[PDB]
Amino acid sequence: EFGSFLVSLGTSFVIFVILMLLFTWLSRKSGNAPIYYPNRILKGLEPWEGTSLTRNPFAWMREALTSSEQDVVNLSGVDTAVHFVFLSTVLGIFACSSLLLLPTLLPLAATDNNIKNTKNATDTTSKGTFSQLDNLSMANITKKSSRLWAFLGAVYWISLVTYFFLWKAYKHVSSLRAQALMSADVKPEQFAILVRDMPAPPDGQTQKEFIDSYFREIYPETFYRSLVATENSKVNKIWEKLEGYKKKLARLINESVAKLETEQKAVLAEKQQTAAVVFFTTRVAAASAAQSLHCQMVDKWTVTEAPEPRQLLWQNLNIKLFSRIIRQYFIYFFVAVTILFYMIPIAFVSAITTLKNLQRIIPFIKPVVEITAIRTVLESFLPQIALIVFLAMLPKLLLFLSKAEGIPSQSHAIRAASGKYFYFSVFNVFIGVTLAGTLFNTVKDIAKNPKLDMIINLLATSLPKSATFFLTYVALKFFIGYGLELSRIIPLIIFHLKKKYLCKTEAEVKEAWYPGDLSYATRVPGDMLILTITFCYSVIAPLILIFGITYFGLGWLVLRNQALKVYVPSYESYGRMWPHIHQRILAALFLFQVVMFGYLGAKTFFYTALVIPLIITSLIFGYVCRQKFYGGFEHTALEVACRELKQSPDLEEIFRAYIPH
Amino acid sequence: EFGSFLVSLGTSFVIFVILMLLFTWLSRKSGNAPIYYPNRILKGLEPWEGTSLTRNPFAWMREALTSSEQDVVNLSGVDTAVHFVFLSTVLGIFACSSLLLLPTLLPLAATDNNIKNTKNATDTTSKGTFSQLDNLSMANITKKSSRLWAFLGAVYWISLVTYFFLWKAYKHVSSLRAQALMSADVKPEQFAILVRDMPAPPDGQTQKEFIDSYFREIYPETFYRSLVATENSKVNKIWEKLEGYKKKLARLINESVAKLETEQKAVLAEKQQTAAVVFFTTRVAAASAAQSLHCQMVDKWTVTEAPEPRQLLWQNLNIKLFSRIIRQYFIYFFVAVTILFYMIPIAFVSAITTLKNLQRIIPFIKPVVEITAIRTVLESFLPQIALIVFLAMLPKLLLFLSKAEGIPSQSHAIRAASGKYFYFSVFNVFIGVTLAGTLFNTVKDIAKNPKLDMIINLLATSLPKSATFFLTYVALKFFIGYGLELSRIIPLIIFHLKKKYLCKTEAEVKEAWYPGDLSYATRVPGDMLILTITFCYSVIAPLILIFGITYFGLGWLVLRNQALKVYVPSYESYGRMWPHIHQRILAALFLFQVVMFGYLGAKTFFYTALVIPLIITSLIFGYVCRQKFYGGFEHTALEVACRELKQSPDLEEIFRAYIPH
């Protein structure tokens, strides 16, 4: 496989060179401003800096490297800042860990020869079964070791560093959240409530008046209005989407309006059911109402904190708690079945990966056609591309599933997608590649040698070989992905094709060049894969830390110049993602700990019980942390909803902001 | 060991007969009313029923078996009712599970002979190594089985039943909580708040006025007063305790008062620091204030729900969040070290348990003096008594530790004790006894036979033998404990000794006969041990279900006639224990599942992966449940603090209720 690693890494450098070189040329062209420098045009701030020259080649860099933390916050938001905190803390963990671990352990994993001793019993002339593997706590560390002590103390170094960083971070994100919250404006969200599970109207009372009185009693000076309506039904949601389509085509009529009106009225003709956004009067009242159980026997009047208008997911605002729980259960069962099918395809990937060992026996004669040329390529671009493809259809499905539970707020739904993706990822990817590699190799080598005193050694061999494969994958990703992102070559092609053969109006060009968000449902989930792989295989094969620094490090560079210069944020959750990210980073430390308790044992290190203490510490850190911080990342404090509102918060305008269409 | 089981069970029946017979005699004596029928005297309701006869022998039974659920609630409280719900749901799980499982599996574990086949390879005439073990998915089920299918489908039956019951329960407890909450009275707790982490006063402002303004701004019509004071210091806590001692002796003076005043004043002379109980005006305001984050950056103004006066743990009201987290961490580390030392003593217990196998070679022939007589007794009363002793010093320590974290409210502190005890229990007890038995027996008999095809079989043998030992333990407990409880012979002795040779006044007798609570920090933790043992060893040895029904079943009988007739409740948490109990019961289902995935595998049942699906379901059930219910078991709803307060809630009296001394 060394030959193949060399190809993949090599080729990817070629692509990064060509794509990044393209960037340094296509950006200078001012006619490409709408796809290289947006978020500087939409928010009128001039395509780039004062035109002047052509911006010394390395200019994007200077800007990114000297962009103030606060500058990101003001320009983009307090969500971009949190993503950047994520990237940075991971980077740091990796950095320090790397330093120490790397030097020590790399010099200590070549100064042994368990691979060569294993090679004393490798059936018959088994050539090229390793190479370069001899540089990673692999099959090259003799069982009873006296050197494995260093590969346990390492677990501590990574772990302790993970703790310092995650704590320091939670604090820093919290500071950001508050600061931002205490420095905002009116905002149509700081005055609402979202009741979602209301009981039925009584005798012949109108739904509106029912809600009206209830809230007007508890708070008899703050109730203002109440927008129920079920948003003219979701069938009208669809009809208005179609009316938008029609006006776009202008840039059916009568009968279509008829349809809309009729369906909407006929559905409201009995009950608009639950879901209203009781708009309060002053903010403190709305804030207090938010964090307060309005009824015991939790199944009636569930009051949340009311999402901003842009993310209220009016579709699933109804539900009824019974249905919500049924949905939760079914959705979780489906994600588990999907984890199993993906295990199937990932086994497929690792198989495609070890070609010699595959052709050895599994299909035996079937792939005897593998020569040397085809071999290298089919195990240097194919296996990797497969993983990308499979784990790319996931983000979409996961969101659709999560948004079918009932979660109001797109923010929480994106967070749930991220979570289900973490599960998938972890389990599938890691376990799969690792175990499958191991199994293949060790299978037609275990059929002969029995006992057990050798089987564990062979299984460890194979664990580090799967490590080398994941390394090449991470590399590929990093290079090509960041290349494409900085070049935005895909979007460039699209825009400069539309603005040449498809754009009819100037508004059309405007529509075409609108950038998008940082897609926090494909970025963070995907970056979590890299986190887990580079955490687990950090001591078992310490080279996926020198590839890991690069991924997350190029992150803070590429993505910064893709946030102060292109992606314009969609929603704003004032930092409400860190809790999720923190739990996941800590769960990687935990999976890593469980695996570095297993592997250390297979390589017979009787004192491997000294990793159990850490398996506990992680779990305690969890509880302790959540208690201290999660609270603040949940609600808007009363001390933020009591700040001076100079201009009397004009209501009615606020009421008209949550208005459906 | 069969001989010993027969002795222990037999002897314990003797004790239950003698103690329960004593009860049916000593209770009739009316002069024993103060220790057999309190909580009927304190709350003037006449010692028993209309005196009339002598109450047909079985009278306690009739009363208990026909005591209304609500009658328990009104007489005692909404905490006794929840304990009874606990006992009952566990009973039910066990009941149904038992039915099915038992019949099927017992007839299927004697109709095989893996014990006899193992006995074909028992070195040299190993006699008495088993007996009666041949009736419990033990060493008597042949490896590849075709009968083990039934012992997997069983895991499902127990699991599914556990789910039905736990759900049905959460609902029922919630209904109780609310009903009770919507039918109470004024109560000095429904109008307070407990701020605990206040920032320092500003320039030269007085602590009081600082708190005063802050809250009087956010709520400018509901702030009434504020009791800070640090309760004249805890040194004065001690001094007032001593003044109470002095008045009791009356039933030092001057210099002691001097001490008190001086220390108190000197400590308040700088700052009474944090912790005030801002008393609001109307209940809805207090309720809203409770569930509301009064400041972002959670480290200032932490507002809880304010414990009732009787449980405000004024001692640890101060702290400061930094210190609280340090304490949390240290306390958890200490509980882990204690778990390790207890593992040491529990290994000691199982060792004392298998005497033949112990003397085999472990202490050489140091104990070759074991004959037959001494043998039976030293393994029928000794091992068991040891476990009781050890696991009885735990409750006290655990509370002391938990109340040193900082938890305000004795209710939560008792809950935390319960939790740490669960951990201890589970780990220690189960793992210990099981594994140690196994190890002993399979430690000399493995030094010979190598391979592995036999080692697993031997390990399973030993797992079921440890099962038989736990069975006898549970029995012992049940019998003797409930005997003592119904007889209250220990307390009788004490009272009728004081009221004969130690009581000086009538108030002294009153003091002596005051019963106590149901000690929810020794009952529930201890009953959780029995739950776990009888859950784990429910399929591995299905006979600890017919001993389990009895424990929890005699519970609802004995303890009922020990709650409507003796223990007068101390605090009232309106049901806030069920969340804890539910999580723990579910964690037993989980430990059981993990062990019935291990054992089923050791007895080579290749399709043992079908227990993994359930290991997931449990965890999902967890999340789903907490989400739906825990909320309601956290705060007092606004719809409960808006109910008609006919008599204007006299404040000042409420303020004077939280007054320190």
Author numbering:
A (entry chain A), B (entry chain B): 2 to 252, 287 to 696
Please quote the authors directly.
Inspired by the observation of the extended state of AtOSCA1.1 channels in the nanodisc, we attempted to solve the high-resolution structure of another member of the OSCA/TMEM63 channel family, the higher pressure activated mechanosensitive atOSCA3.1 channel which exhibits a half activation pressure threshold that is much higher than that of AtOSCA1.1. Our high-resolution cryo-EM data obtained in a detergent environment contain two conformations of AtOSCA3.1 channels. One is identical to our previously low-resolution model of AtOSCA3.113, which we call an extended state. We analyzed each monomer of AtOSCA3.1 in the two states and found that the single monomer of the contracted state superimposes with the extended state. Therefore, the major conformational change occurs in the central cavity. In the contracted state, each subunit of the M5 and M6 linker forms another dimer interface through an L487 interaction. Therefore, the area of the central cavity is reduced compared to the extended state. Furthermore, the dimer interface of the AtOSCA3.1 in the contracted state was ‘locked’ by the interaction between each single subunit through the M5 and M6 linker, presumably providing an additional energy barrier to overcome during activation.
Mechanosensitive (MS) ion channels are a ubiquitous type of molecular force sensor sensing forces from the surrounding bilayer. Briefly, the central cavity created by the dimer interface couples each subunit and modulates dimeric OSCA/TMEM63 channel mechanosensitivity through the modulating lipids while the cytosolic side of the pore is gated by a plug lipid that prevents the ion permeation.
